[PDB]
């Protein structure tokens, strides 16, 4: 009779990425009109993270669903709309992400 202990199933975080120069150290996948990264979800997902890049230093993990970037919601966004938002984000990139337990 081992009772299941309390466990987090889903998280929504606000992560602030800091890049003085160069990149955010992440790749994104998916978007409206593209093949899904996870099952049927058409949302923008983080497909990889550089270990020596800023995103890893901010807590960004692989599989995080990208919901918002510095005040722009990416719900139902085409892939190139997320792309443009991220490239055009300045030195501080605060994003809202949806995370799921593995």
């Amino acid at each position: 009779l081992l009772i299941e202990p309390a466990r987090i199933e889903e998280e929504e975080l606000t992560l602030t990425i800091l890049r003085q120069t160069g990149g955010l150290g992440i790749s994104i996948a998916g978007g409206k009109g593209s093949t899904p990264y996870k099952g049927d979800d058409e949302g923008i997902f983080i497909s990889r993270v550089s270990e020596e890049g800023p995103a890893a230093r901010a807590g960004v993990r692989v599989g995080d669903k990208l919901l918002e970037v510095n005040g722009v919601a990416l719900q139902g966004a085409e892939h190139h709309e997320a792309v443009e938002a991220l490239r055009g984000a300045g030195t501080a990139v605060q994003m809202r992400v949806w995370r799921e337990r593995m």
Binding site: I26, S27, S34, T35, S47, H79
Partner: peptide, 7 residues
């Protein structure tokens, strides 16, 4: 159509 983009 599958896009992946590093930024």
């Amino acid at each position: 159509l599958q896009s992946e983009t590093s930024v």
